[PDB]
Structure formats: C-alpha cells, structure tokens
Amino acid sequence: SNNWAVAPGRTATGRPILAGDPHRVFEIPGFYAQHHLACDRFDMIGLTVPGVPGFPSFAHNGKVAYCVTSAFMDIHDLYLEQFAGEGRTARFGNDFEPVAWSRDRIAVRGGADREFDIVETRHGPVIAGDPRDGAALTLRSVQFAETDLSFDCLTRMPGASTVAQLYDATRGWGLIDHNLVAGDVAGSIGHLVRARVPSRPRENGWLPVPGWSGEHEWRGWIPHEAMPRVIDPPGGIIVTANNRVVADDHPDYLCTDCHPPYRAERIMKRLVANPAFAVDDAAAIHADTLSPHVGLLRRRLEALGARDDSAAEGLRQMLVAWDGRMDAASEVASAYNAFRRALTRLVTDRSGLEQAISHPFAAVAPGVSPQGQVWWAVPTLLRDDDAGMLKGWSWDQALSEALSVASQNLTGRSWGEEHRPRFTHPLATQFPAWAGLLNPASRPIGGDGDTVLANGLVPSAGPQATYGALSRYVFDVGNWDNSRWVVFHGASGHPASAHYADQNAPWSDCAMVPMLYSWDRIAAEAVTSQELVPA
Amino acid sequence: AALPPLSGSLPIPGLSASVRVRRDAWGIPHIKASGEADAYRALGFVHSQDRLFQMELTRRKALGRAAEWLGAEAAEADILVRRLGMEKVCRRDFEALGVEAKDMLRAYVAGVNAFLASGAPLPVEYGLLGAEPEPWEPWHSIAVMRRLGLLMGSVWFKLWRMLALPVVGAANALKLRYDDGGRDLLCIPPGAEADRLEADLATLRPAVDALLKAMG
Numbered sequence: 001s002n003n004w005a006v007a008p009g010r011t012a013t014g015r016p017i018l019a020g021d022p023h024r025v026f027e028i029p030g031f032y033a034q035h036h037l038a039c040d041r042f043d044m045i046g047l048t049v050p051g052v053p054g055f056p057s058f059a060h061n062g063k064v065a066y067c068v069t070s071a072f073m074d075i076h077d078l079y080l081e082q083f084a085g086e087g088r089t090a091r092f093g094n095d096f097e098p099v100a101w102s103r104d105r106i107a108v109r110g111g112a113d114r115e116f117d118i119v120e121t122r123h124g125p126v127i128a129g130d131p132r133d134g135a136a137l138t139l140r141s142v143q144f145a146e147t148d149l150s151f152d153c154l155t156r157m158p159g160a161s162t163v164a165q166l167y168d169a170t171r172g173w174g175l176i177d178h179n180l181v182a183g184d185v186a187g188s189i190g191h192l193v194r195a196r197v198p199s200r201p202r203e204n205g206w207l208p209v210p211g212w213s214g215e216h217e218w219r220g221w222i223p224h225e226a227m228p229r230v231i232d233p234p235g236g237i238i239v240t241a242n243n244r245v246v247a248d249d250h251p252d253y254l255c256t257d258c259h260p261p262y263r264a265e266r267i268m269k270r271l272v273a274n275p276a277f278a279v280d281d282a283a284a285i286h287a288d289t290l291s292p293h294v295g296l297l298r299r300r301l302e303a304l305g306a307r308d309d310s311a312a313e314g315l316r317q318m319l320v321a322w323d324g325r326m327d328a329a330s331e332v333a334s335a336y337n338a339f340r341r342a343l344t345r346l347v348t349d350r351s352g353l354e355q356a357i358s359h360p361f362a363a364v365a366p367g368v369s370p371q372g373q374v375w376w377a378v379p380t381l382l383r384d385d386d387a388g389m390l391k392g393w394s395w396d397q398a399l400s401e402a403l404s405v406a407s408q409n410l411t412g413r414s415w416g417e418e419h420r421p422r423f424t425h426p427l428a429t430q431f432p433a434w435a436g437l438l439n440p441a442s443r444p445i446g447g448d449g450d451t452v453l454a455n456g457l458v459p460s461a462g463p464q465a466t467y468g469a470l471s472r473y474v475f476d477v478g479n480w481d482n483s484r485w486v487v488f489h490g491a492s493g494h495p496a497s498a499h500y501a502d503q504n505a506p507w508s509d510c511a512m513v514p515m516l517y518s519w520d521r522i523a524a525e526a527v528t529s530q531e532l533v534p535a
Numbered sequence: 536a537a538l539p540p541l542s543g544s545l546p547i548p549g550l551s552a553s554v555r556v557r558r559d560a561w562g563i564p565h566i567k568a569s570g571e572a573d574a575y576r577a578l579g580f581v582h583s584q585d586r587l588f589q590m591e592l593t594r595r596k597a598l599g600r601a602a603e604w605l606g607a608e609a610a611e612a613d614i615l616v617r618r619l620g621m622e623k624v625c626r627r628d629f630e631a632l633g634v635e636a637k638d639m640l641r642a643y644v645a646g647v648n649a650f651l652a653s654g655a656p657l658p659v660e661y662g663l664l665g666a667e668p669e670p671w672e673p674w675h676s677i678a679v680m681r682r683l684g685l686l687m688g689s690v691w692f693k694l695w696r697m698l699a700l701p702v703v704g705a706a707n708a709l710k711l712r713y714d715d716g717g718r719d720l721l722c723i724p725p726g727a728e729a730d731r732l733e734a735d736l737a738t739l740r741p742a743v744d745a746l747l748k749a750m751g
C-alpha cells in the first residue's frame with residue numbers, strides 16, 4: 001500500500017494534500033467499497049468494508065482526512081510448546097499444566113463433514129504439528145489474545161476536527177496494524193502507528209520461540225502514547241509504503257520483517273522534487289513503473305558477459321539495454337519478469353527450499369510459497385554475491401542458467417498484456433460455464449510488486465497480476481469536491497450490473513473520478529434516488 | 536429482473552425518519568440520514584443491495600462455514616479460523632464495547648436484515664449455489680472486520696524461517712527476509728535512513744536448537 005501527505009508550504013493549494021492506494025489481492029468483489037454517509041453528527045466519505053459499519057481506515061469528514069498503509073508491526077508470535085500427557089499437558093516453567101481440548105466439525109460442499117480437535121495452551125491455539133508427538137506450534141496474536149475495543153474507535157473518529165483529535169479517537173485500535181496518515185483543515189499533517197503491540201523480546205520476531213522457558217512471554221502492552229508518531233515534520237512531507245517505520249534501535253521491539261524501501265524512496269524522490277505538489281500530480285506518482293533492480297541486473301549481466309546459447313545471449317542483451325520501466329507498453333519488461341521468475345525458481349530448487357514446505361509444521365492454511373518468499377530475498381543475495389544457499393553454484397552460473405530457461409519462456413507480449421489480471425470470481429471454478437459472466441473484465445496494466453504502481457504477482461504461477469491497488473485516492477483538504485478516487489472494478493457486486501466493472505477503465509489508466517462531497521452537486525447529478533422509510 | 540430495486544421507496548423497521556440514497560454516474564451511493572442510528576441502518580441496507588454475496592461469503596470465511604459454498608479448497612482455512620476461535624473472540628469484544636458502538640452495530644445489522652426481508656431477487660450466486668441468505672447478529676461485523684486482516688504480516692516470515700532451518704541451516708535461514716535495498720528509508724523521522732539489525736545467532740541458539748530437535 002502507499003500513501004503520502006504534503007504540508008501546506010509544499011502544495012500548490014497552500015492546504016494539505018493526502019493521497020495513496022491500498023494494495024491487496026484482487027479478490028472479487030473488491031474488499032473496499034466507495035460510500036458517502038451523512039447524518040446530524042457527521043458527514044463522511046471514503047472507503048467501507050461491506051459487512052462492517054463506518055469508515056475504519058480511508059475517509060474524510062469535512063475537517064480531517066485519513067488513510068492507511070499496513071505498518072508491518074510484529075503482532076503475531078509463534079511458540080514452540082513441549083507437551084506430555086499424550087498431548088493433554090503443556091510445559092510452562094517447570095510444571096506441565098492441562099491443555100484445553102475440544103472437538104468441532106465443518107461441512108464441505110460435495111464431501112464428507114470433517115471433525116477435528118481444537119487444542120489450546122496458555123499461549124493460544126495449536127495451529128501446526130501434533131501435540132501427541134510431544135511438540136507443536138501455538139499462535140499468540142494481538143488479533144485474538146485479549147479483548148479488543150477497535151469498534152469503539154469507529155464511533156469516535158467521525159467527530160474528530162484535527163489530526164490530534166483523530167489520533168486520540170483511535171486509542172484502543174488493535175485489529176490490524178496501520179500507518180494512519182492524516183491531514184486537517186487547520187493545515188496539519190501527521191503519521192501515527194495505529195496498532196496494539198505487546199512488549200516482548202526482538203528474538204520473538206525471527207522464529208517460533210520456546211513456550212516453556214519464560215523468556216519469551218508478553219510483558220504487557222506498548223502504551224498508546226509510546227507508539228511512533230510525527231505531526232508537522234520540518235520537511236513538509238510524509239510517506240509510508242510498508243517500509244520500516246522506525247530504526248531497529250528504537251527502545252520497543254516493533255518490527256523484524258517489512259517491505260523493501262523501494263516504493264517509499266520513489267514516492268519521496270518525486271515529492272522532494274515537487275515543492276508545489278498539486279492534486280493532479282498524485283496520479284503520476286500512482287503510475288510510477290521504474291524498477292529499483294535495473295542497475296543491479298545490468299551490472300551483473302554485463303559482468304557475466306556473452307553466452308554460448310544464441311537465444312540466451314539475445315535475452316542478456318535486451319536486459320542489459322532495458323530502461324528498467326515496467327510500463328504496460330514494454331515488451332522487454334515481460335522478458336525481465338520471465339528471467340526473474342526463472343532465476344527465483346532455479347535458486348528455490350537448487351537450495352532445497354522448494355521442499356521445505358513438506359514438513360508437518362508447514363501446514364497453516366493457505367501455506368507459504370517457497371518461490372514467493374525467495375523472490376524478495378534474491379536481490380539481497382545477488383547484491384552481496386552471497387552464494388551460500390546455491391550448493392556450490394556461483395551467482396554467475398545461476399544467472400547463465402536462468403538466461404537459458406527464460407529464453408524458452410518469452411511470449412513477446414507487452415507487459416500490460418502479459419501481466420493483465422484474470423479477475424476470478426469465487427464461484428468461477430465451481431461453475432466454469434458461468435466464468436465469462438462472473439469474472440469482471442480486465443484491461444492491460446503495468447507495474448510489479450517493486451514499483452509504486454504495485455501490481456504484484458505469484459511468481460510460482462506466472463506473470464499475471466494478482467494483487468495491486470484496490471482503490472486510488474487523493475484528498476484536497478479544505479476544497480473537498482476536488483478530491484478523487486477510483487476502485488479496480490466498480491461499486492456493484494452483481495455481475496450483470498452496469499457498475500460491476502465500469503471503474504476498471506479509469507483505474508487501468510491510473511485515473512480517478514470525482515469524490516463528491518457537496519449535497520447540492522450530488523442531488524443535481526444523481527442517476528437513481530431511493531427513500532428508505534420507517535416501517 | 537435479477538438485480539434489487541434501487542429506486543422508489545423501501546421500508547426499514549426501526550428507522551426514525553426517511554433516509555435518501557442517491558447513486559451517482561458510477562453507482563456510488565451517497566446516503567443522507569437525520570440521526571446516527573438511521574445512518575447505520577441505511578448503510579447496512581445499502582451495503583447488502585450492492586454486496587450481499589460478498590458480505591455473507593466473508594462472514595462464512597470468518598466463521599469456518601465457507602467450505603459449505605466453496606468445497607474442499609476452503610476446508611483447511613475453515614478449520615484454522617475455528618481453531619483461532621473467531622466466534623468466541625468477536626462475542627467477547629462485542630460484550631466489552633461501549634453503548635455507542637453496540638448501538639452502531641445493532642442499527643447496522645437491523646439494516647442488513649431489513650434488506651434480507653425486503654423481497655429483492657437474490658443475487659446470481661445464491662441461485663448458482665441453491666442457497667438462501669442467513670440473518671445477521673451485531674457481533675458478525677466484528678468477525679467480518681477481523682477476517683479482512685486475518686494473520687497478515689509477521690507470522691508467515693517466522694514460519695518460513697523455521698521451515699528453512701533443517702534445509703539450509705541457521706545462518707542461511709536467518710537471512711531469509713525481504714530485501715532492504717542495502718539500507719532502509721524509515722518513516723519516522725521522515726527521510727531518515729538506518730541499517731536494520733541482522734539476527735543474533737548467539738541469542739537465538741536455544742530457539743534454533745529446540746526447533747531442529749522438534750522438527751527432526
């Protein structure tokens with residue numbers, strides 16, 4: 001997800017501007033829907049989650065605008081438990097205490113019911129391994145451990161009039177960890193880490209840790225007022241894009257794993273270069289396709305030198321010459337993506353990591369993809385020339401083999417056509433004759449998971465985009481009807497509606513449509529109007 | 536004929552006054568109510584008019600009932616949310632909320648259930664599945680919200696490093712994490728950079744040893 005806020009001293013309007021785009025899998029219908037909801041207490045427009053009241057994360061109320069990216073706070077620990085008692089007891093300190101065991105059942109369409117055990121220790125439920133074998137993994141997560149009052153925030157946030165009032169209204173939010181970026185008509189901008197994080201050692205971030213030793217227990221909660229925040233920074237720019245929120249020498253442990261800083265650095269670069277940032281400038285940032293890896297790739301392929309196989313040498317030459325842009329019109333971007341998928345597969349196979357998921361402790365739905373994880377580590381290993389996992393191969397041997405394999409996988413399609421998402425409705429595989437009706441239409445789009453236009457993929461499956469911006473938005477704080485937004489298919493969840501897939505056209509162009517706030521304009525422009533009346 | 540009516544007038548039991556819902560050229564609903572309870576009743580009704588299958592499928596995924604619609608592909612995910620105790624923690628949370636949030640949730644599901652009682656044709660997916668919608672309770676919205684964000688982030692990286700231990704060894708497994716470009720750009724302070732801490736194999740040695748034994 002990306003977002004950013006630009007202070008009044010650096011905007012064309014002399015008021016704050018906020019903009020961004022959340023990135024999630026393209027499940028259908030889209031997770032976020034556009035709504036405007038007004039009553040005597042508030043008048044709010046933004047994104048809702050169908051099935052949930054209010055505007056948890058993306059909205060303005062005519063005084064404060066706010067939006068989020070996932071903060072990558074570490075809110076989930078895994079504990080390795082020692083069991084005895086045929087799985088009925090678990091060690092804590094030097095005592096084995098009773099574990100809770102119960103039975104439950106699910107029904108499965110077209111198959112037999114499945115009965116199963118639910119086993120719970122002082123840490124949380126067993127999610128992997130068989131306690132009867134003496135060891136299993138339990139999960140202690142902020143999402144489940146203790147009473148959560150995030151829903152009390154949904155009635156408090158609509159009343160906020162300033163960035164600071166909005167952050168006080170978010171006290172107690174713990175369901176999901178967010179970078180909550182806000183701006184207000186008084187001219188302030190801010191970033192709050194809106195999360196509940198337990199106080200415990202940094203070691204818990206690396207691996208499942210011993211549940212019995214007492215050394216890895218949660219010691220209370222990091223207080224609200226200790227969470228990282230900034231309001232009105234002196235450079236007039238805030239950017240978040242799932243990158244490391246604070247340095248690791250911060251006194252509370254908050255994060256081990258987060259995205260690479262590519263997207264934050266590219267947004268920051270574009271904003272530092274524009275100290276008269278206009279509402280119209282947000283779309284060009286949303287659309288940015290420069291890959292951070294072009295320099296590393298070019299250097300390593302040049303040093304590798306000419307290949308014997310003619311098709312591999314053609315591919316090498318095109319990659320050394322590539323401008324690094326994942327533009328929809330680029331055929332060479334597709335060849336880069338095929339090359340990197342082939343390299344990731346070869347490294348995952350040679351290392352033995354493809355088979356790491358054969359272990360019983362891997363069995364946590366939906367499972368880890370070895371290539372999908374190795375994909376993000378390859379740039380570090382290649383930049384450092386660390387060939388420790390290649391069982392005797394050098395990176396040069398891996399790159400050369402990847403040129404050969406990839407040369408047989410070149411379709412020649414522009415990246416927009418190669419990467420075009422196949423939006424799949426949840427019932428399309430059960431009702432295949434209906435897939436043409438159920439699946440919303442898609443257009444060619446560029447980007448990859450490293451670019452600000454973060455249309456990512458599943459590397460073990462192929463190049464098609466599987467996740468990306470579910471919505472894009474820009475808030476013009478204090479000139480609200482100039483704000484804009486879009487979603488990746490449309491307002492309707494009904495496959496037959498004119499509004500099921502109509503916003504895919506602007507979204508695929510990295511354009512937005514008006515986010516209308518004024519009631520007289522809304523009334524004048526309404527296409528349907530309905531009265532909901534007392535019964 | 537297979538879409539719900541978006542014009543005219545429809546009743547909602549429990550509304551205090553009328554609510555007007557105007558859709559713009561993109562179908563986006565702009566909802567104008569008098570009081571706050573009516574606003575949340577209207578929002579539950581309007582979410583159901585456009586997204587009822589999404590709402591019920593996301594609630595089934597939270598409550599471990601999605602394999603009833605999706606088949607075996609969803610069985611292991613249903614078993615995992617039953618083991619996490621979704622219903623228990625969402626009823627826990629609801630009971631502890633303030634009056635204003637309980638009343639928000641009650642009004643919102645009254646809106647959903649009025650839509651289910653409104654006589655609209657069911658969405659195409661209920662025809663395909665031979666299904667009928669089941670009614671909503673106030674704590675259901677807490678399960679839907681919890682499902683949206685279920686288990687994202689750190690737990691997968693930890694699980695992955697553990698799985699890598701018996702394959703590539705501790706020193707290599709503890710380099711399995713997303714790249715930092717050589718040096719992170721931090722969010723706070725804005726523009727600041729820093730080198731991340733690498734794993735301390737010495738302090739992790741008891742955890743590594745216990746996991747290798749447990750896994751072997």
Ligand SMILES: N[C@@H](CCC(O)O)C(=O)O
Nearest residue numbers: 001022023024068069070
């Ligand atoms: N979808 C996100 C924004 C963060 C992005 O997904 O990283 C969020 O709403 O959590």
